Design a protein around this ligand. Structure first.
Ligand SMILES: Nc1ncnc2c1ncn2[C@@H]1O[C@H](COP(=O)(O)OP(=O)(O)OP(=O)(O)O)[C@@H](O)[C@H]1O
Ligand SMILES: Nc1ncnc2c1ncn2[C@@H]1O[C@H](COP(=O)(O)OP(=O)(O)OP(=O)(O)O)[C@@H](O)[C@H]1O
Ligand SMILES: C[C@H](OP(=O)(O)O)[C@H](NC(=O)/C=C\CCCCSSCCS(=O)(=O)O)C(=O)O
Ligand SMILES: C[C@@H](OP(=O)(O)O)[C@H](NC(=O)CCCCCCS)C(=O)O
Ligand SMILES: [Mg+2]
Ligand SMILES: [Zn+2]
Lengths: 259, 51, 50, 521, 442, 50, 50, 50, 442
């Protein structure tokens, strides 16, 4: 067979990117947020009530006979028939453990039937509501992919990914969805990801210490680990660029001899 | 970029090949991103990633 | 995206159409305005019966 | 003549004979009743007859005998063998054997209708008309034909007040009737109905029932209907089976069978009296209006003044669409009112609750738990995870297992059943086992005010009496106040004490459940 | 012969059809089936008689919201139908053994007219079909119901709609699969006008057949653009064979291997297959592991990556049963493959750029419409030369009715007209048969 | 007739908030000829006064 | 010419239907008034709460 | 993404010198943040030569 | 078959060829020569090799007065024209007997290529020829002279001027008889986009051959636009036969009868011939004595008037030997014919109005120019459906050198390339032969 490498490089940032891309790597969990708390921060549905449906279950609807379409097993939320919801994250440039393109690549490498979108200060994944809640609790919130200070589940107004951290080390939030409770040392979400206030604040845990954030981040920084210390990634990027250029010029084997 | 080019190539000291494009563009990109990392004022001025 | 189509690409009424060829112009230019549209622009039927 | 046979089939699920020695025969037109306890195997048997994934037999087989066009893939009734197609060809008779990959299976599967238990197979965003219109167009008909039916149909399940209304914003039994009206409108060879009426009130249930007859029995479409609630099995089926834990305890004329079943039964436990203690909630002019620029105003709650007196069980009875779920969601601080006051006496202070936040509604919302009429669990988690880790239990994980077992036992499971159920997924339970698990999930946090939107609906009289004594014991030993929305009257007589009647968003009169009964009749 | 590449042809069920088929047997310049589809698309016109009747009855000539009082004609086009079709056929007739075919669709409310190839042999462009059909229909309507001489302009406005003022058929009831040649994004872009929904509705929501239709049109268009000329012809032929026609059963094999899998598992299976077939080899191993990969056959590696792209879209959109995932799957399939192997993606980044285009076009308020209206004659989607559009057909075929731009909403007339032709309803089978008919001439 | 080609264009240009009122086109051209028509689109607030 | 050039008529019935059904947002006359205030602030050059 | 392939391409729709490229170049006809700097790169090609 | 009126056939010298030829024998839908002309006009591309060498040597890429310093390539394409043509033929070849011909013109200075028909069968339009020729030329220049990878963009700019930015071929050294589809002013106007100077230079300034070329192209275009279908077809068939092919030798006889005459003498000759042939009869005699005439055959009177219009243009512009008189002659031939007979003009006054606008835009500041730059796609000369452009071609053939924008100035590459083919240069003697080939099939 083929043993899959995931990312070039020898530094800790490349190792963290490889770990995020690896579906067989168990991400270290750092907090326990209950399922109903994740649902409440998500703000899509009331916990305890049934999922809203967009179509009948796949057994009820009649489709044409398609051999290639029926080879793929659908998701459970697709089997019952559920609306497609989203969960959106903002990641600070100051050593957040997960980063937008890294998030999108890891989501599309690890999860089935997801819709990943990458912006500079935004990253959103869309899926059926039950499966989306499942991997939001299991992977997105409780593991080392999330830090309540340098990252945040937020839709609507997103700003502060490139700004400096506040006095408590948290990312800037124009709507202030999550605040810092100095009596317990924990970050508490007082609003959901879109902005309406929550009736009961939910503990997402305490901020990750900066020393651990240096080890678990996936961003390259001059004050942390720079790409000049990782020449293998730059060489792979340059090889990809040269291969694209040679393929766009003349896509033959003799023109790729100068690769 | 001009200083780095004049120190090792010159203004018209090299013929356009792949290697000089990779070297110059990679060095200038690494410098610009290092300056964004080193100076929070520069990063907060160009807050959007597209900029 | 579906709402964007429904809100700004579903029932848009433009004053004039784009013109082709050597008279190349965009929409809402006076070469694209039909005679009936311009008749509807003028409001004299509102205030006069002659 | 004969439609389908059932050979000696024993369905097992890992040393779990959900069903064994099941065999019955049906002809072209007859209603067959499947009567039994909760978890007896009725939903498994209907998914078995439907041919859904995971319901393949381990021992036996079922034969479907149909008509068929080899050029058109239309399946029909076997009686059509001898008649003329809607295409060329005459017809051919096929002994489709399900679970044998017999082509026709696909066409036959399209020709059979199923009413899923506690699952609304509707498009949600396609209103009421387009949902039914879809059914017609999908199955065939034509502009006029469809229109005629659509209107004639919306009349039968009684939905003329919600025609352009979005079906996602409907209310429980209304969605049930919408799914029903979608389910007649396909011309099936068989209509498998799992709990066709639902937790529906007497009157609306009667309309559903007559609609079913008006249609399926007219087109001599065989009926397989389950209800572990007999009075329908009799008024609908002529030949009914009684099974107990997957084994046919009897196979007879429906009348004798229902008799025998009802003898096996138990009466209620009329608990001891209780004195209540002070007012806890006070709602003053609560209104809830759903205004649309395209369908009119739906005044769900139309000015409602109620008071609950603390440790007491309060009932809310009414007809479908009266506004009980909207009211209960207003009480649980889930849906804000358009107008009106709600104060909750935490201990002596009345927090104004139409104000969001921990400083205001939150205060009382820590001790408010709601079981929804359209409930759900977490299907990717186990039952033990659902009671303990999914909601957050304030105890170490080693000691949460016996707490969840105690809660399941208090709900009305045995020790063996609760032990076997803990390491299981919600998809492996029955509708009624999932309902009791959701009730336990509400109860296990021990909130003060508990709202229970239709606790019963799929419980044998015995299971229902169980859930009932549960609520009564917890109210007295734990002074828990309850608000109950229900349709079973005898539950209100032997459980509730100060029920209220809801009619079109009003409160009419509040009083004793017997007084409410003589007001109703 | 000039290409030594041999392919094995498979059907839509994954069964073998023939082996050692030459690569040029599926070429648009050789395949008779592809020629027949091109000619049929060029000469087929769809006429909405019910729309003409409704427009003339209410005086709804013009465009959106346009209505001329007093210019209302009460004719019965649907009731007559057969007489109008006979008159149109008689006017459009050139020889007696002509290919003129005016058939009646949906009981008189629609017409499917095929103008003869004699009128297209002396035409520099395909627009002769719609103009000739419009003229024949105008004459048939004027002669059948005795229209006054002063209402022929109203009849023309109802049929065609604002044509001398607006160089298009906007408010009319006559349609074709190809738009106006002056409304193309670039020169030679005429064949990239069929949207995804039209291809899905024509193939009756069949996955492989819609993929084959989209790929055949896109690669024939690249031949029309002059792109697949010289050193690019081999790469476009390999792309067509492996992406649309399931050469060597690659798409079916990847889907079967990744039934429970994700996009990354599809990437892994594609890399494993390309290593096993000898398409790619190890270039060098860096200090931190990561043995770099280089293509031993560049065009074959591009074809393998395109087949894997189609399979990844099918796997993800069959898992979700929703057609909204196409942009992310193409984008991050290419990204994961590039940063996993150090190899170029499909179309050397053009597929990834077109996936970014799909992303901003179908996922934002800046976006417009869904993936069902994707066509190569759009500025957003023109950049990939027939490598990003055929996966969108698989995505829309895997959709469980959760899209506003469903094929039923946008392409019912197109499906009812063009599904009657065998080479359009099942393009895969008949393209394979046409390739089999010309095996021995290479 | 109330309109000629488009009812929506007829209603839209009946708006009193339009600077050019299309009820009397002859009268306003007279006003623009006598330099008593206040037109729009003047950049007076972003330009120097000298 | 300026008033004719700067006029675009857009219908809001598919947008309201998409908001009510697909987006699950109620459309009331109060919501339409709020939208009209927002577009009247935002159409000339405005940015809402930014 | 399509840039590296289209920068030194020779195909009809993709090849153009950067001096002859513009906002109507098919890759460049949608997006902010590229065109003005493309013009500066085109100038810098000749500024190095004087 | 459906038309029972026969015509005679005469050559350009006025000698009889055959009699009783059916009218459909010269129809574009039946005549093999017209079909071959349309097929060959879509695949023939004019290449300026000396222009390519001069553009690359001086860096003249960009268009009008555009120079890019630094992008200068020194190649010897005119000397290596044989190798370049061989490589272009190798690239463009489909099979080995495909009608691919790359002939060398003017000692390597020009190149006339013909892309194969099979490349155009799967193309929706005619733009495949120029794009395929451009790509083949780019590859041939890149592999003949070992041009760097960073200069292939300059080679592309030299061959095609600003194509991705300007949807046209303006600054390049490649050309065709037909214009770009983006320049079409209406659908079906692709065959109308041949300027008068191109047709005059193609026929080597032969009057009757240029009349035949322009008439064949214009009436085939009217067939393409759908104008000449149904009851309109006979009028355009007779207009092509009489004005363009001198069926009953009407043009030559009228010119011979008015060798030293004016426009008015041609008008009376036309009326006398139409009366003698029974085409027109006296309707009524008025109180003033004016004889109002009516057509016994409307389309035949149309054809007679069109042939007389061409004859009057030839007479007046052969007397003046200047091509600036076409608009006045076309105006006043119709103007005095209508008020002499009471009969409509050549195209029911659609052609007199074409002359009234031609008289505007050939003598004013507002646009247009010389008569040689106009065409059927022009906004000034599009209104007459094939009845006003062959007079302009005849007048430009009769010009002795009084025009600044002569065919020598305007069409030097196109004329020299397209005059090498016998079918384009002398369309009369081959269209008559094609009619004789199918004379017995009606
Ligand atoms: N997928 C499954 N795997 C294992 N056991 C299952 C599965 N589905 C159902 N069961 C069990 O099989 C038995 C029959 O369940 P079924 O849903 O048929 O009950 P039922 O008779 O319909 O009762 P109810 O009134 O609750 O609907 C129950 O014990 C149930 O827990
Ligand atoms: N979100 C909504 N938008 C509009 N109308 C609604 C909405 N929710 C409920 N309604 C309507 O308001 C009425 C009251 O609904 P509610 O769910 O409170 O009824 P109910 O008394 O619980 O009836 P059931 O017995 O069916 O549960 C119903 O007719 C319902 O269709
Ligand atoms: C301007 C361009 O067309 P053109 O370049 O050909 O003129 C035009 N582009 C668009 O419509 C599309 C998207 C532009 C919006 C991007 C603004 S950047 S700020 C927020 C963007 S994001 O947060 O959602 O990523 C088009 O119609 O294709
Ligand atoms: C003929 C054509 O000019 P060109 O030949 O294309 O330069 C065309 N003229 C016009 O339509 C001029 C319109 C106004 C001038 C005369 C008004 S009576 C134009 O400007 O494009
Ligand atoms: Mg059940
Ligand atoms: Zn049949």
């Amino acid at each position: 067979a083929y043993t899959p490498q995931f990312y070039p490089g020898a530094t800790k940032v490349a190792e963290n990117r490889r770990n995020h891309l690896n579906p067989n790597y168990e991400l270290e969990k750092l907090r326990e947020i209950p399922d109903e708390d994740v649902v409440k921060i998500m703000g899509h549905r009331q916990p305890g009530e049934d999922y809203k449906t967009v179509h009948p279950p796949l057994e009820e609807m009649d489709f044409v006979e398609d051999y290639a379409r029926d080879l793929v097993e659908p998701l459970n939320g697709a089997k019952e028939g559920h609306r497609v919801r989203y969960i959106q994250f903002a990641d600070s440039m100051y050593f957040a453990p997960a980063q937008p393109y890294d998030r999108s690549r890891s989501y599309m490498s690890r999860l089935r039937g997801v819709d990943a979108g990458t912006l500079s200060g935004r990253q959103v994944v869309e899926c059926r509501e039950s499966d989306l809640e499942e991997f939001s609790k299991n992977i997105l919130m409780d593991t080392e992919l999330f830090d309540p200070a340098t990252s945040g589940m937020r839709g609507a107004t997103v700003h502060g990914h490139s700004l400096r951290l506040d006095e408590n080390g948290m990312m800037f939030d124009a709507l202030q969805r999550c605040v810092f409770d100095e009596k317990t040392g924990h970050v508490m979400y007082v609003k959901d990801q879109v902005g309406k206030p929550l009736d009961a604040p939910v503990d997402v845990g305490e901020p990750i210490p900066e020393a651990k954030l240096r080890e678990i981040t996936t961003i390259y920084r001059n004050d942390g680990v720079a790409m000049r210390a990782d020449p293998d990634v730059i060489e792979v990027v340059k090889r990809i660029h040269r291969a694209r250029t040679l393929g766009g010029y003349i896509p033959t084997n003799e023109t790729f001899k100068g690769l | 970029a001009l200083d780095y080019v004049e120190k090792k190539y010159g203004r018209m000291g090299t013929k356009a090949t792949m290697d000089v494009v990779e070297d110059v563009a990679g060095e200038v990109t690494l410098y610009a991103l290092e300056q964004y990392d080193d100076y929070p004022a520069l990063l907060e001025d160009h807050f959007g990633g597209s900029q | 995206a579906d709402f964007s189509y429904a809100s700004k690409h579903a029932d848009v009424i433009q004053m004039g159409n784009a013109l082709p060829g050597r008279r190349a112009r965009g929409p809402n230019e006076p070469g694209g305005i039909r005679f009936g549209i311009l008749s509807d622009v003028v409001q004299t039927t509102r205030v006069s019966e002659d | 003549m004969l439609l389908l046979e059932v050979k000696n089939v024993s369905k097992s699920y890992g040393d779990t004979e959900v069903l064994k020695n099941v065999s019955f025969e049906l002809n072209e037109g007859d209603v067959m009743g499947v009567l039994g306890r909760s978890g007896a195997g009725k939903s498994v048997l209907l998914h078995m007859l439907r041919g859904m994934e995971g319901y393949e037999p381990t021992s036996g087989q079922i034969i479907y005998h149909v008509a068929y066009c080899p050029h058109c893939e239309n399946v029909e009734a076997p009686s059509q063998v001898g008649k003329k197609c809607e295409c060329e060809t005459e017809y051919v008779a096929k002994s489709v054997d399900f679970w044998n990959n017999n082509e026709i299976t696909y066409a036959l599967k399209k020709k059979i209708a199923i009413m899923l238990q506690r699952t609304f197979a509707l498009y949600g965003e396609k209103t009421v008309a387009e949902n039914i219109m879809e059914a017609l167009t999908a199955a065939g008909y034509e502009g006029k034909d469809a229109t005629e039916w659509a209107l004639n149909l919306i009349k039968m399940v009684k939905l003329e007040h919600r025609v352009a209304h979005i079906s996602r914003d409907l209310s429980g039994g209304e969605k049930q009737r919408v799914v029903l009206a979608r389910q007649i409108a396909k011309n099936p060879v068989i209509f498998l109905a799992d709990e066709p009426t639902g937790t529906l009130d007497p009157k609306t249930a009667k309309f559903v029932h007559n609609a079913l007859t008006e249609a399926v029995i007219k087109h001599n479409i065989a009926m397989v209907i389950t209800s572990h609630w007999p009075e329908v099995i009799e008024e609908l089926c002529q030949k009914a089976i009684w099974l107990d834990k997957g084994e046919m305890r009897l196979v007879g004329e429906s009348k004798h069978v229902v008799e025998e079943f009802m003898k096996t039964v138990t009466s209620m436990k009329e608990f001891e009296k209780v004195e209540v203690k002070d007012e806890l909630l006070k709602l003053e002019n609560v209104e809830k209006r759903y205004v649309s620029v395209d369908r009119g105003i739906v005044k769900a709650v139309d000015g409602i003044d109620v008071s609950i007196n603390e440790k007491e069980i309060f009932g809310l009875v009414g007809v479908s669409g009266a506004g009980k779920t909207t009211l209960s969601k207003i009480i649980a601080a889930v849906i804000p009112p358009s107008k009106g006051n709600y104060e909750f006496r935490l201990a002596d202070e009345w927090v104004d609750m139409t104000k969001v936040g921990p400083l205001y509604r939150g205060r009382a919302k820590r001790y408010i738990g709601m079981l929804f009429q359209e409930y759900s669990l977490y299907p990717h988690r186990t039952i033990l995870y659902n009671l303990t880790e999914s909601i957050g239990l304030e105890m170490p994980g080693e000691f949460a297992k016996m707490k969840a077992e105690h809660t399941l036992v208090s709900v009305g499971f045995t020790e063996e059943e609760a032990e076997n159920m803990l390491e299981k997924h919600p998809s492996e339970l029955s509708v009624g086992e999932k309902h009791r698990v959701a009730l336990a999930q509400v109860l296990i946090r021990e909130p003060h005010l508990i709202l229970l939107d239709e606790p019963t609906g799929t419980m044998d009289p015995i299971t229902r009496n169980q859930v009932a004594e549960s609520i009564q014991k917890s109210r007295s030993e734990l002074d828990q106040t309850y608000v109950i929305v229900s349709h079973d009257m005898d539950f209100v007589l032997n459980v509730c004490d100060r029920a209220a009647l809801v009619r079109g968003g009003k409160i009419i009169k509040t009083g004793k459940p017997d007084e409410i009964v003589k007001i109703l009749s | 012969v000039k290409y030594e590449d041999k392919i094995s042809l498979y059907d839509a069920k994954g069964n073998l059809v023939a082996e050692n088929v030459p690569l040029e047997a599926i070429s648009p310049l050789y395949n008779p089936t592809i020629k027949s589809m091109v000619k049929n698309i060029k000469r087929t016109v769809a006429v909405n008689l019910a729309g003409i009747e409704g427009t003339l009855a209410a005086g709804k000539i013009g465009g959106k919201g346009c209505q001329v009082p007093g210019r209302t004609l009460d004719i019965s086009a649907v009731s007559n139908a057969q007489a109008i079709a006979d008159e149109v056929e008689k006017i459009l007739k050139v020889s007696e053994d002509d290919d003129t075919a005016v058939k009646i669709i949906n009981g008189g409310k629609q017409l499917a007219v095929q103008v003869p190839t004699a009128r297209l042999e002396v035409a520099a462009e395909y627009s002769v079909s719609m103009l000739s059909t419009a003229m024949a229909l105008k004459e048939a309507l004027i002669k059948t119901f005795n229209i006054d001489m002063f209402d022929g302009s109203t009849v023309h406005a109802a049929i065609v709609g604002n044509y001398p003022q607006v160089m298009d058929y906007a408010g009319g009831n006559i349609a074709s699969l190809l738009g106006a040649p002056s409304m193309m994004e670039g020169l030679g872009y005429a064949l990239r006008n069929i949207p995804v929904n039209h291809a899905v509705a024509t193939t009756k929501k069949n996955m492989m057949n819609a993929i084959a239709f989209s790929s055949v049109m896109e690669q024939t268009a690249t031949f029309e653009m002059g792109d697949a000329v010289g050193s690019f012809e081999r790469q476009h032929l390999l792309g067509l064979a492996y992406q649309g026609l399931n050469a060597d059963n690659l798409v079916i094999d990847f889907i079967k291997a990744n039934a429970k899998g994700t996009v990354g598992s599809v990437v892994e299976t594609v890399i494993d297959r390309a290593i096993a077939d000898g398409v790619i080899v190890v270039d060098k191993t860096m200090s931190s592991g990561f043995n770099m990969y280089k293509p031993a056959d560049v065009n074959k590696w591009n074809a393998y990556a395109a087949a894997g792209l189609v399979a990844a879209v099918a796997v993800s959109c069959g898992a979700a049963r929703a057609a909204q995932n196409v942009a992310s799957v193409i984008l991050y399939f290419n990204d994961i493959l590039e940063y996993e192997t150090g190899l170029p993606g499909v179309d050397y980044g053009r597929s990834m750029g077109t996936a970014v285009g799909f992303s901003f076009f179908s996922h934002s308020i800046y976006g417009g419409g869904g993936p069902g209206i994707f066509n190569g004659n759009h500025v957003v989607t023109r950049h990939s030369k027939g490598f990003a559009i055929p996966p969108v057909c698989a995505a829309m075929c895997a959709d469980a009715g959760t899209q506003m731009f469903s094929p039923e909403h946008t392409s019912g007339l197109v499906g009812s007209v063009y599904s009657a032709f065998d080479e359009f309803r099942e393009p895969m089978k008949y393209v394979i048969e046409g390739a089999l008919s010309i095996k021995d001439q290479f | 007739d109330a309109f000629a080609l488009n009812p929506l264009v007829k209603v839209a240009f009946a708006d009193p908030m339009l600077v050019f009122d299309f009820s009397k086109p002859r009268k306003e051209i007279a006003r623009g000829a006598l330099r008593e028509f206040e037109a729009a689109g003047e950049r007076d607030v972003i330009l120097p006064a000298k | 010419w300026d008033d004719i050039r700067r006029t675009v008529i857009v219908g809001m019935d598919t947008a309201h239907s998409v908001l009510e059904k697909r987006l699950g947002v109620e459309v009331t006359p109060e919501t339409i008034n709020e939208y009209m205030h927002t577009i009247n602030h935002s159409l000339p050059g405005g940015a809402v709460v930014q | 993404q399509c840039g590296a392939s289209n920068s030194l391409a020779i195909r009809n729709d993709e090849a153009a010198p950067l001096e002859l490229r513009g906002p109507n170049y098919p890759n460049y006809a949608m997006n902010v943040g590229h065109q003005g700097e493309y013009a500066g790169i085109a100038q810098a090609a000749h500024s190095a030569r004087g």
